[PDB]
Amino acid sequence: PPIDPPPGTGKYTCPFAIWSLEEVYEPPTKNRPWPIYNAVELQPREFDVALKDLLGNTKWRDWDSRLSYTTFRGCRGNGYIDLDATYLATDQAMRDQKYDIREGKKPGAFGNIERFIYLKSINAYCSLSDIAAYHADGVIVGFWRDPSSGGAIPFDFTKFDKTKCPIQAVIVVPRA
Amino acid sequence: PPIDPPPGTGKYTCPFAIWSLEEVYEPPTKNRPWPIYNAVELQPREFDVALKDLLGNTKWRDWDSRLSYTTFRGCRGNGYIDLDATYLATDQAMRDQKYDIREGKKPGAFGNIERFIYLKSINAYCSLSDIAAYHADGVIVGFWRDPSSGGAIPFDFTKFDKTKCPIQAVIVVPRA
Numbered sequence A, B: 001p002p003i004d005p006p007p008g009t010g011k012y013t014c015p016f017a018i019w020s021l022e023e024v025y026e027p028p029t030k031n032r033p034w035p036i037y038n039a040v041e042l043q044p045r046e047f048d049v050a051l052k053d054l055l056g057n058t059k060w061r062d063w064d065s066r067l068s069y070t071t072f073r074g075c076r077g078n079g080y081i082d083l084d085a086t087y088l089a090t091d092q093a094m095r096d097q098k099y100d101i102r103e104g105k106k107p108g109a110f111g112n113i114e115r116f117i118y119l120k121s122i123n124a125y126c127s128l129s130d131i132a133a134y135h136a137d138g139v140i141v142g143f144w145r146d147p148s149s150g151g152a153i154p155f156d157f158t159k160f161d162k163t164k165c166p167i168q169a170v171i172v173v174p175r176a
Helices: A092-094 B090-096
Strands: A018-020 A024-026 A036-038 A041-042 A081-082 A103-106 A113-119 A125-129 A138-143 A169-173 B016-018 B025-026 B036-037 B038-040 B080-082 B101-105 B113-119 B125-126 B136-144 B168-173
Touching: A024 A103, A092 A103, A103 A125, A113 A169, B025 B101, B080 B168, B090 B101, B101 B125
Parallel strands: A036 A103, B036 B101
Antiparallel strands: A018 A041, A018 A125, A024 A036, A081 A138, A103 A113, A113 A125, A138 A169, B016 B038, B016 B125, B025 B036, B080 B136, B101 B113, B113 B125, B136 B168
């Protein structure tokens, strides 16, 4: 039996640019066995949770140290846990599609080619570069729902996936 | 900041014999640097939780496999986790006093010498042999409250202790 996330107590507006990526900008090359899509900006959307819902006083895993430079309000815990933003951008994360991740070309002559995490909760994509930019304080909160070990969360990110720990929201973790 | 256990929603009568161990039966020998105490039975006492409170549908850690022979109602999770009953009886557990554990002599000519876990919650002791007897289905539910890793629970029992994961109750985990 899978464990459901606790109920949301409100709404949160994804604080980063959100995207549609369905038009293929570039076919799969040999060295890059995936399409680079056309990243089309969408008007803001709301996760079905409140910022308070994902916060609490457990430390974040902070897989990639983006949170170690100062003091932040902690994680709700109870099975909520930040995901490795930086890892999710790697070629391996993309090969594995353990999460749904498309590569995209942002609008404009100078729109960077970036890696986008898919958010089913609002049917949109969010740039991993936007989220994980230096001192952007972006955090991908997933919910761990494998019942093994009283809901205890493995130490290696590679063991995670949309089935076992689906993304619940993307936030900016406030400062404490 | 330490994390408090969630509130109990009732009372549970420790389903095993409970004890006072303050009268020294035997001084510390060289090979056994602890007193063997006199185990005096007390009338039943109640933890400040209900059996339902500690149950849920996360699998138990089942450190010592006493739960692997069949099908049980699962653990509440949210930071609750069974402790290693068998380990807690070892000489190392006793040397370390990571938990409060006294050795005792049960009443009577033929009262076995056993190892007792201390339950602050009701100010009594419970025999680890009673709890962990074959198909007794006894379980020592502690509450994990180290905030590291979104409240994620280490894989090694040796990392546990009364400070980080204090015993909340001792139960008989029903069958599912």
